[PDB]
Amino acid sequence: IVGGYTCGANTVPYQVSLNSGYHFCGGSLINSQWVVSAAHCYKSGIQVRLGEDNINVVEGNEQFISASKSIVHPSYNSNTLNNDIMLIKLKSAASLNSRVASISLPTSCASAGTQCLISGWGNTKSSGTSYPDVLKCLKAPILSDSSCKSAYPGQITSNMFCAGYLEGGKDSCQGDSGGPVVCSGKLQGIVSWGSGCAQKNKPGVYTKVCNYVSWIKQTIASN
Ligand SMILES: N=C(N)c1cccc(C[C@H](NS(=O)(=O)c2ccc3ccccc3c2)C(=O)N2CCNCC2)c1
Ligand SMILES: [Ca+2]
């Protein structure tokens, strides 16, 4: 997170860290056994880490559970990052408590202007590489589709939305991928891509989760 702030220990209880000997992506706990992340985060040998703040220290409240299966959306295109969504099933259910809780799916899409909370352990620098120990947070508004499309001509599909600041300086970045975009207590998006990080007139593009609620529900119900 570039331009964000320290969240505070376990203030984002649905935030998940995908680990494989190191943190490589984020995710969101949607129920005790299912995590929603980004398709481009797909990798084998995934350990899901819940209740994390400092990802390098064992402070307590953590729960390390292996992923039993990762279901990348069938129509995901690795070049356009369209349908950039993936479901991870936990080998065991998580122990839902105060510091580890699930987030709700949207029953409707969020409109431009809605303020959302984006979080993750990704790069904090625009020009360079700096990774945080603790979870960073960033509040950013969902931009308008015209603006989103004016920034990324011919690259935005109906399953994507822009969020962030056109002036730059505040944005998600590498390592945040898969992470949540919560608007009004509903998981509205997934950190997907963007041209660089926190650049002028180049806001972050996120996967529009509201277009996938049915798919998620049906997929989870069949596995
Ligand atoms: N600015 C953001 N909000 C943001 C969020 C996540 C990741 C990145 C870094 C990167 N930005 S980039 O300019 O290097 C970039 C942009 C679009 C891409 C599309 C396909 C493949 C790689 C791409 C890399 C990126 O978009 N990806 C990381 C690698 N995999 C796909 C997503 C930026
Ligand atoms: Ca920890």
Curated annotation (Swiss-Prot):
<dbReference type="InterPro" id="IPR050127">
    <property type="entry name" value="Serine_Proteases_S1"/>
</dbReference>
<feature type="disulfide bond">
    <location>
        <begin position="148"/>
        <end position="162"/>
    </location>
</feature>
<keyword id="KW-0378">Hydrolase</keyword>
<dbReference type="GO" id="GO:0006508">
    <property type="term" value="P:proteolysis"/>
</dbReference>
<keyword id="KW-1015">Disulfide bond</keyword>
<feature type="binding site">
    <location>
        <position position="57"/>
    </location>
    <ligand>
        <name>Ca(2+)</name>
    </ligand>
</feature>
<dbReference type="GO" id="GO:0097180">
    <property type="term" value="C:serine protease inhibitor complex"/>
</dbReference>
<dbReference type="InterPro" id="IPR018114">
    <property type="entry name" value="TRYPSIN_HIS"/>
</dbReference>
<dbReference type="GO" id="GO:0004175">
    <property type="term" value="F:endopeptidase activity"/>
</dbReference>
<dbReference type="GO" id="GO:0007586">
    <property type="term" value="P:digestion"/>
</dbReference>
<feature type="disulfide bond">
    <location>
        <begin position="116"/>
        <end position="183"/>
    </location>
</feature>
<dbReference type="GO" id="GO:0004252">
    <property type="term" value="F:serine-type endopeptidase activity"/>
</dbReference>
<dbReference type="InterPro" id="IPR001314">
    <property type="entry name" value="Peptidase_S1A"/>
</dbReference>
<keyword id="KW-0479">Metal-binding</keyword>
<feature type="disulfide bond">
    <location>
        <begin position="109"/>
        <end position="210"/>
    </location>
</feature>
<comment type="subunit">
    <text>Interacts with SERPINA1.</text>
</comment>
<feature type="domain" description="Peptidase S1">
    <location>
        <begin position="1"/>
        <end position="221"/>
    </location>
</feature>
<dbReference type="InterPro" id="IPR043504">
    <property type="entry name" value="Peptidase_S1_PA_chymotrypsin"/>
</dbReference>
<dbReference type="GO" id="GO:0097655">
    <property type="term" value="F:serpin family protein binding"/>
</dbReference>
<feature type="disulfide bond">
    <location>
        <begin position="173"/>
        <end position="197"/>
    </location>
</feature>
<keyword id="KW-0865">Zymogen</keyword>
<keyword id="KW-0106">Calcium</keyword>
<feature type="disulfide bond">
    <location>
        <begin position="25"/>
        <end position="41"/>
    </location>
</feature>
<keyword id="KW-0222">Digestion</keyword>
<dbReference type="GO" id="GO:0046872">
    <property type="term" value="F:metal ion binding"/>
</dbReference>
<protein>
    <recommendedName>
        <fullName>Serine protease 1</fullName>
        <ecNumber>3.4.21.4</ecNumber>
    </recommendedName>
</protein>
<feature type="binding site">
    <location>
        <position position="54"/>
    </location>
    <ligand>
        <name>Ca(2+)</name>
    </ligand>
</feature>
<feature type="binding site">
    <location>
        <position position="62"/>
    </location>
    <ligand>
        <name>Ca(2+)</name>
    </ligand>
</feature>
<feature type="binding site">
    <location>
        <position position="52"/>
    </location>
    <ligand>
        <name>Ca(2+)</name>
    </ligand>
</feature>
<feature type="active site" description="Charge relay system">
    <location>
        <position position="84"/>
    </location>
</feature>
<feature type="binding site">
    <location>
        <position position="177"/>
    </location>
    <ligand>
        <name>substrate</name>
    </ligand>
</feature>
<keyword id="KW-0720">Serine protease</keyword>
<keyword id="KW-0645">Protease</keyword>
<dbReference type="InterPro" id="IPR033116">
    <property type="entry name" value="TRYPSIN_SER"/>
</dbReference>
<feature type="active site" description="Charge relay system">
    <location>
        <position position="177"/>
    </location>
</feature>
<feature type="active site" description="Charge relay system">
    <location>
        <position position="40"/>
    </location>
</feature>
<dbReference type="Pfam" id="PF00089">
    <property type="entry name" value="Trypsin"/>
</dbReference>
<dbReference type="InterPro" id="IPR001254">
    <property type="entry name" value="Trypsin_dom"/>
</dbReference>
<feature type="disulfide bond">
    <location>
        <begin position="7"/>
        <end position="137"/>
    </location>
</feature>
<feature type="binding site">
    <location>
        <begin position="174"/>
        <end position="175"/>
    </location>
    <ligand>
        <name>substrate</name>
    </ligand>
</feature>
<dbReference type="InterPro" id="IPR009003">
    <property type="entry name" value="Peptidase_S1_PA"/>
</dbReference>
<dbReference type="GO" id="GO:0005615">
    <property type="term" value="C:extracellular space"/>
</dbReference>
